[PDB]
Amino acid sequence: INELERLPANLGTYSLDDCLEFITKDDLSSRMDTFKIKALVELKSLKLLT
Amino acid sequence: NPVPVTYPTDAYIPTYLPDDKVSNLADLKKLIEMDSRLDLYLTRRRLDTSINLPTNDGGKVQYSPNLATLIGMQTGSVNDAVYSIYKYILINNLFVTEVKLDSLLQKVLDTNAAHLPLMNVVQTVNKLVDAEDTAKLREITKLALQLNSSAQKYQFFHELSLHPRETLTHYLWSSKQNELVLQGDQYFNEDAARTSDIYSSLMGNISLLYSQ
Amino acid sequence: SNIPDPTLPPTEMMTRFLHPNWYALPTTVWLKYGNYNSWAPSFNENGTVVD
Amino acid sequence: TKSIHYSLANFNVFQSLPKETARGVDDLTRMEMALLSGIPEEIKWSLKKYLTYSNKAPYMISLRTLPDLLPLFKTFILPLERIVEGLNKSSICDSKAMDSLQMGLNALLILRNLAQDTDSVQILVKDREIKSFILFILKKFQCVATGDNKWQLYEGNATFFNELTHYTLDLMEAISSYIAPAMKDDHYFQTLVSILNYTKDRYMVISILRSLSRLLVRSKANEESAADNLDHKTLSLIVSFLLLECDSELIIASLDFLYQYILPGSQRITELFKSKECSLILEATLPNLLSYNIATPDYHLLQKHVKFPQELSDVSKVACTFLCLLSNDTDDGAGSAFCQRIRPLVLHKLADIPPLTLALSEYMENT
Amino acid sequence: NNVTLKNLTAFQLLSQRENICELLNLVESTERHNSIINPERQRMSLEEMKKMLDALKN
Incomplete structure (x- = not known):
């Protein structure tokens, strides 16, 4: 914790598959928050153990 | 009420052994019945009755000069006092059966009601004045169970001689139906109920529970 | 939500826990009748499991 | 939510019109219909709920209220007369024998429960098929009690056997009241008198003494009757329970049985006092039974330096009524010589306990 | 005391197997028979009867 x-x-997260969507400097890349969700899940699931 | 104990007190002493192979079992039955008759004579003389003081330090009491006219004595135990007072209430036929108080009772009781319950009468009367046998019974009941065990093993092997086909299939079904019972509580042991290995019928159960 | 964090000492899965295989079963109770009684019943069976 | 396109469960004709009991068969009809279907694993539930309604609401499944129940239960009771015929060898050998033995013991305990309230036992005594089964179980348990070699227990099955007797005996307690014997050699009395001498457990001893007591009412003692099968070997035991001063249930059962055995005629009294091991017990126990757990005046001033009792226990009341009835026997029968040999000992118990003088009225008017 | 369903079902199997594994002659139980017959309780008890029977004659 x-x-x-x-x-x-x-x-x-910067992934090696965003090249195929041609993200520009003024737009939102898909799958941007990938390790953020994978970290929040491991955090809230450790707080919800009891 | 008899107190419950934590050890068996007696045993049935079975009688399915062949009485022409094992001998002196009837001798044991005769000895047990005789001991069952040797203590019915003791318990009787424990409730023995004795008449030793009809009339005959705090066992001797000096009676008042008033009560000395219903007794014939001036001293004596309290038992003699209450007994002789009751005898005087009985001889003169004073109980209402159609206690009605007599004339001298008026003085001895200092009461003019001429009618008083017997309870108040005797109230005024007061107002005027072992280990070894447990060990033996546990040692014997510790052998009639060993006998009751060897007799059961004989009963099993003898009932196995006759009809072995019937006993063996019963043993194989008891085995296939008892090894399952003993393997029903190995799922909840606190070290395999928090490791998420048994949670992946513990799934239909949560359906019934949520519906409940 | 005031859910205790796992650091607190409530955490333990089974402290008191009984399984029906561990339930006490009714059995024959034994009675004591003085010390000079051999005709007393000395049993009390109301439909126990071993009985 | 509530729409026709979402689901077709209320269109215009059933949204509050269906009755409140339209959810299947009722919990009673479901039991009755799942009891005659042949599928196992279903009877084991019907006979579980009937077994529940026989200890939490017996007034709901009473035999009189439903005159189609004993026909069903006898289909599970009667096969026990065949199963019990075994139990001297390995009679249970698969998972279908136990399935038919437990389904029978449940149907037997259900009748044992429904045979306790009144106006329900009045249906078992009418059907001979149950009284015959009870007699059969009592016969087998007599064979176990006597010790003969015609039938052996095979102790490994005692678990299934000792749970049948403690139910048939309880079926006999409610049935022995509704019958009264008139012949000497008669079953239901030779079996009980044989079991009582062996059973060696308090519950059976009390249940048997109550059954025997209820098998002697509505009878006269001037001719042959069931009271002539017992002898000075069983009466020398029922009266021996008076010596047991460790409980207040065997003494009451024994005094009640003797009071019921003495009631008719005066020849019963002459017979009871024939032996010299039954008169010596009553002579040295009936005085002491009038002060049993009565808190005696506690005369202990003879070693020191009164509070007489006010009430009396149930055993003292029963022994008092016993001496009352024994008092008015005859001027020559042993019933009067007994009350005369007990006078100098009942007198001390009258002097130390006041309230006996009102209860021992009839005993004193006859001496 | 304090017997339960598990303590009883595991006792029935132990009693059935002690007998079955003895029919196959796989079990040696001589340290149990040398507590009933083989000990001197078979001889010393007879040496106590041999004197109680004589004490009971006078």
Whole structure:
């Protein structure tokens, strides 16, 4: 919990498949928040253990 | 009421052993019946009755000069006082059966009601004055169960000689129906009920529960 | 939501827990009748499992 | 939500019109219909709910209210007369024998429960097929009690056997009241008198003494009757229970049985006092039974330096009524010589306990 | 005391198997028979009857 509640809250992911969508500097890339969701799930699931 | 104990007190001493192979079992039955008659004579003389003080330090009491006219004595135990007072209430036929108080009772009781219950009468009367046998019974009941065990093993092997086809299929069905019972509570042990291995009928159960 | 975090000491899965295989079953009770009684019943069976 | 296109469950003609009981067969008819269907694993549920309604609401499944129930239960009771015929060898050998034995023991305990309220036992005594089964079970248990070699228990099955007797005996308690014997050699009395001498457990001893007591009412003691099969070997035991001063249930059952055994005629009294091991017990127990658990005046001032009792226990009341009836026997029968040999000992119990003088009225008017 | 369904069902199997595995002659139970017949309780008890029977003659 300590090592997980200290991660940047602005955590995003750059994947090697965004090239095929031609993301421009002024648009929102798909699957931007991938490790953020995978971190929130492991955090809330550790707080919901009891 | 008899107190429940935590150890068996007696045993049935079975009688399905062949009485022409094992001998002196009838001797045991005769000895047990005789001991069952040797204590019915003791318990009787424990409730024994004795008449030792009809008339004959705090066992001796000095009676008042008033009550000394219903007794014939001036001293004596309290038992003699209450007994002789009752005898005086009985001889003179004073109980209402058609206690009605007599004339001298008026003085001895200092009461002019001429009619008083017997309870108040005797109230005024007061107002005027072992281990070894448990061990033996546990040792014997510890052998009639060993006998009751060897007799059961004989009963099993003898009923196996006759009809072995019937006993063996019963043993194989008891085995296939008892090894299942003992393997029904190995699912809840607190080290395999929090590892998420048994949660992946514990799924239809949550359906019934949620509906309930 | 005031759900305790797993650090707290409520956490344990089974402290008191009885399974029907561990339920006490009715059995023959034994009675004591003094010490000089051999004609007393000395049993009390109301339909127990071993009986 | 509530729309025709969403689901067709209320169009215009059934949304509040269906009755409140339109959800299937009622919990009683469901039991009655799932009891004659031949499928197993279903009878094991019907005979479980009938077994529940026989201890939480017996007034709902009474035999008189439903005159189609005993026909069904006898279909499970009668096969026990064949199963019990075994149980001396390995009679249970698969999962279909136990399925037919437990389905029978449940149907037997259900009748044992429904045979406790009044106006329901009045249906078992009419059908001979149940009284014959009870007699059969009593016969088998007599064979177990006596010890003969014609029938052996095969102790491995005692679990299934000792749960049948403790039900048929309880079926006899409610049936022995509705019958009264008139012949010497008669079953239902030779079996009980044989079991009582062996059973060695308090519950059966009390149930048997109550059944025997109820098998002697509505009879006269001037001719042959069931009271002549017992002898000085069983009466020398029922009166021996008076010596057991450790309980207040065997003493009451024994005094009640003797009071019911003595009621008719005076020859019963002459017979009861024949032996010299039954008169010596009553002579040295009936005085002490008038002060049993009565809190005696506690005369202990003879070693020191009164509060006489006010009420009396149930055992003292029964022993008092016993001496009352024994008092008015005859001027020559042993019923009067007994009350005369007990006078110098009942007198002390009258002097130490006041309220006996009102209860022992009839005993004193006859001496 | 304190017997339960598991403690009873596991006792029935133990009693059935002690007998079955003895029919196949796989079980040796001589350290149980040497508690009933083989000990001197078969001889010393007779040496106690041999004197009680004589004490009962006077």
